[PDB]
Amino acid sequence: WQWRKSL
Amino acid sequence: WQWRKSL
Amino acid sequence: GAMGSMERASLIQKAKLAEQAERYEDMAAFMKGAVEKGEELSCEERNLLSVAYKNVVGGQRAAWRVLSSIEQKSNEEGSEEKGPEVREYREKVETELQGVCDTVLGLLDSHLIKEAGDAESRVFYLKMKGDYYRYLAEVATGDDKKRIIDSARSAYQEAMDISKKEMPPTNPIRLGLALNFSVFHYEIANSPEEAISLAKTTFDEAMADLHTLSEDSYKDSTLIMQLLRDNLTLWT
Amino acid sequence: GAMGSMERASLIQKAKLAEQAERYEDMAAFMKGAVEKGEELSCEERNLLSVAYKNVVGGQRAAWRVLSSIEQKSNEEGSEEKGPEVREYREKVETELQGVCDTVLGLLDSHLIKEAGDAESRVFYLKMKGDYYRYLAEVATGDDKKRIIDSARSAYQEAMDISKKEMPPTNPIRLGLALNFSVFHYEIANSPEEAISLAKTTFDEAMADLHTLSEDSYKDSTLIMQLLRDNLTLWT
Ligand SMILES: [Cl-]
Ligand SMILES: [Cl-]
Ligand SMILES: [Mg+2]
Ligand SMILES: [Mg+2]
Ligand SMILES: [Mg+2]
Ligand SMILES: [Mg+2]
Ligand SMILES: [Mg+2]
Ligand SMILES: [Mg+2]
Numbered sequence: 001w002q003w004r005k006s007l
Numbered sequence: 008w009q010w011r012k013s014l
Numbered sequence: 015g016a017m018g019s020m021e022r023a024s025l026i027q028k029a030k031l032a033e034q035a036e037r038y039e040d041m042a043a044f045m046k047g048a049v050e051k052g053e054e055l056s057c058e059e060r061n062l063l064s065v066a067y068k069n070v071v072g073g074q075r076a077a078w079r080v081l082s083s084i085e086q087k088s089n090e091e092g093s094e095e096k097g098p099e100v101r102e103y104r105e106k107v108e109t110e111l112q113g114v115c116d117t118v119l120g121l122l123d124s125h126l127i128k129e130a131g132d133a134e135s136r137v138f139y140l141k142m143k144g145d146y147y148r149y150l151a152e153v154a155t156g157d158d159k160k161r162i163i164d165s166a167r168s169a170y171q172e173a174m175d176i177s178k179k180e181m182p183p184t185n186p187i188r189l190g191l192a193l194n195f196s197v198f199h200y201e202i203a204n205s206p207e208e209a210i211s212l213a214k215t216t217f218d219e220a221m222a223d224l225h226t227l228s229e230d231s232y233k234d235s236t237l238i239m240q241l242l243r244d245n246l247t248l249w250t
Numbered sequence: 251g252a253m254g255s256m257e258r259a260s261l262i263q264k265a266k267l268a269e270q271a272e273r274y275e276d277m278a279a280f281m282k283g284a285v286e287k288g289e290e291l292s293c294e295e296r297n298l299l300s301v302a303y304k305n306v307v308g309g310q311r312a313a314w315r316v317l318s319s320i321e322q323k324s325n326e327e328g329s330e331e332k333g334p335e336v337r338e339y340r341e342k343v344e345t346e347l348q349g350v351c352d353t354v355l356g357l358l359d360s361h362l363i364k365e366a367g368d369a370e371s372r373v374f375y376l377k378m379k380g381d382y383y384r385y386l387a388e389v390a391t392g393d394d395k396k397r398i399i400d401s402a403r404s405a406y407q408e409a410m411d412i413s414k415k416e417m418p419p420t421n422p423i424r425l426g427l428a429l430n431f432s433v434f435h436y437e438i439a440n441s442p443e444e445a446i447s448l449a450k451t452t453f454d455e456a457m458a459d460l461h462t463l464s465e466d467s468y469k470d471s472t473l474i475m476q477l478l479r480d481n482l483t484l485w486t
Pocket of ligand 1: 102103106264
């Protein structure tokens with residue numbers, strides 16, 4: 001699991 | 008080297 | 015405004031100093047002052063604005079999530095009553111976060127977006143409008159939640175339409191916009207299939223354009239493509 | 251004060267929430283409000299106060315050091331003149347840092363120290379007074395630098411005298427006080443030999459008392475002893 005990516 | 012320790 | 019007496023160039027200079035010192039609230043205040051001088055922003059200046067507020071609101075969002083989790087647990091069966099304090103403090107952080115979002119959206123509306131004519135600036139600012147309506151949507155629970163969500167959607171959609179017409183598929187702004195609109199679909203709009211389809215098509219179309227790029231542009235584009243891949247791996 | 255209308259217990263509860271959310275400025279404001287209720291602080295409450303302000307001032311100090319380094323480089327031979335902005339912004343951060351230190355010292359003087367009669371509270375608060383005069387000393391450059399340094403020294407010395415008479419050599423408050431007074435000697439008072447002697451004697455006297463302790467107290471004390479060792483290794 002990992003916090004989904006945003007930019 | 009490392010930043011000396013304080014508490 | 016408190017920055018009204020400082021030169022535009024000094025505000026930009028101090029924004030860069032604040033970034034080096036990791037003083038992002040100062041950085042945001044300096045860039046707000048620079049925007050309020052009324053001149054359009056350069057590419058570098060637009061990214062100073064976004065970096066500053068992204069870090070400020072990112073900290074507020076992380077804090078809001080911690081407090082919201084504590085609040086939800088307090089409302090589970092068998093949880094001891096502890097009074098109004100958790101809700102009050104979650105509300106305090108929420109109100110501060112909404113204020114930051116309103117400030118950014120106010121700068122975009124007065125008057126960054128209406129003066130932005132080039133694709134790189136207009137898409138950048140519309141992505142920002144979508145992002146900050148998305149952050150409002152993350153905490154929204156009342157009568158206006160659907161309108162907040164549709165405001166985010168509408169801003170992202172205009173940015174997507176322009177980016178597809180005016181930018182190559184490897185453009186870093188286009189890629190980051192698609193990444194975030196995909197997250198919007200997955201997390202906000204309850205549309206995981208749309209989120210996955212957008213991330214895949216964005217990735218594949220960029221892959222096919224990499225051959226046109228210099229080494230430095232290749233590095234910039236593949237970095238964001240990996241973030242799309244990270245999300246696809248998480249979601250499938 | 252803005253916290254005057256909130257219950258003492260609610261302020262403490264929200265300070266703990268702020269800590270969980272890493273909102274240390276909020277945490278400090280809550281604990282300031284709790285102190286201003288006028289009742290003495292419990293052991294746990296004293297440590298909430300110190301944690302909050304330590305994190306706030308720690309961030310300000312780190313930022314001040316970044317900016318001071320940039321400023322010093324700008325005053326080297328061959329550096330291009332860039333105007334007053336670096337100095338101004340370093341001064342802004344410096345003034346904010348001094349304000350935090352003055353606030354903490356004001357809480358200690360009105361009226362935490364005068365009501366603290368037990369060794370654990372009195373030594374704790376006098377260590378804090380020494381610490382925040384030390385942070386003022388780090389940025390001091392004018393007529394009052396020597397008096398600021400002597401105020402730090404005097405507070406640390408009173409705390410040391412009490413801790414040696416009233417506490418065992420493994421007491422974590424005594425150990426952390428000695429650690430910080432040693433750093434004061436090394437960094438502020440230009441007395442590295444005193445700094446080294448104090449750290450060594452503190453370490454050795456604690457080592458000889460470890461046999462009296464439970465497993466949990468042993469863990470607490472050896473953790474701080476390792477910090478003394480870290481400094482001795484750095485300094486010799
Ligand atoms: Cl609150
Ligand atoms: Cl300034
Ligand atoms: Mg001008
Ligand atoms: Mg224009
Ligand atoms: Mg084009
Ligand atoms: Mg009461
Ligand atoms: Mg008393
Ligand atoms: Mg005793």
